[PDB]
């Protein structure tokens, strides 16, 4: 479905002159996750607020989930859901600090649990060559592209240094999800300039896009500085 990246469409890391650490930390070990929870408040018409405690680090007591539109919020407001997302803290504030914020990441709980974890294959290309493949796992029937993207990049940061403090080894990168007839992709590099706005980058997950875990596969295309 989505047309592939055009020549010069993808962001180049060489044109980003801020600190890549601000991208890296979105795909380090920490993220929001909750199972079988229901929203307890709402700030604006396109969001839902969840009482999810940060049991790991103790940084927050509530999470605001922002969607692309009212219809998405209306759909999830009184449902028991699972939540999985890359969250941000900078100027995260809402009426309902001790807060964190994310986009989308929401799937209904009931009917969506698998009996066993499913593996999803990622094939990594560097300058067009498949030098590495690995799996990520989920136990959700329908899983958000967000969750899979986070799992994929988390592995690549650990093992291939996809993002570092002040660099990437890669000039461009995109992650492509292929679910039979449906394919779409995200640019993995920050926009040009000397600042990286985490909230604005994450907003791309606000459509709550999801895929069938049984049928999806993942391709990551990176180019080197060669």
Swiss-Prot record:
Per the entry, what this protein does is: Staphylococcal enterotoxin that activates the host immune system by binding as unprocessed molecules to major histocompatibility (MHC) complex class II and T-cell receptor (TCR) molecules. In turn, this ternary complex activates a large number of T-lymphocytes initiating a systemic release of pro-inflammatory cytokines. Also causes the intoxication staphylococcal food poisoning syndrome.
Keyword Signal in annotation: yes
Q: Which gene encodes it?
A: entB
| GO CC annotations on file | extracellular region
What's the domain of life for this entry?
A: Bacteria
| Cystine pairings recorded for this chain | 92-101
Instruction: Name the protein family.
Output: Belongs to the staphylococcal/streptococcal toxin family.
Q: Name one Pfam family in it.
A: Stap_Strp_toxin
Question: This protein is called what?
Answer: Enterotoxin type B
One MF annotation (Gene Ontology) recorded for this entry: toxin activity
Q: Give UniProt keywords alphabetically.
A: Disulfide bond, Enterotoxin, Metal-binding, Secreted, Signal, Superantigen, Toxin, Virulence
Q: Which organism is it from?
A: Staphylococcus aureus
Keyword Signal applies: yes
Q: What is its main location?
A: secreted
- Cell compartment(s), UniProt: Secreted
Q: What else is known?
A: Lacks the zinc-binding site found in other members of this family, such as staphylococcal enterotoxin A, C2 and D, thus it possesses only one MHC class II binding site.
Tell me, how does this one assemble? Interacts with MHC class II molecules composed of alpha/HLA-DRA and beta/HLA-DRB1 chains. Interacts with T-cell receptor beta variable 19/TRBV19.
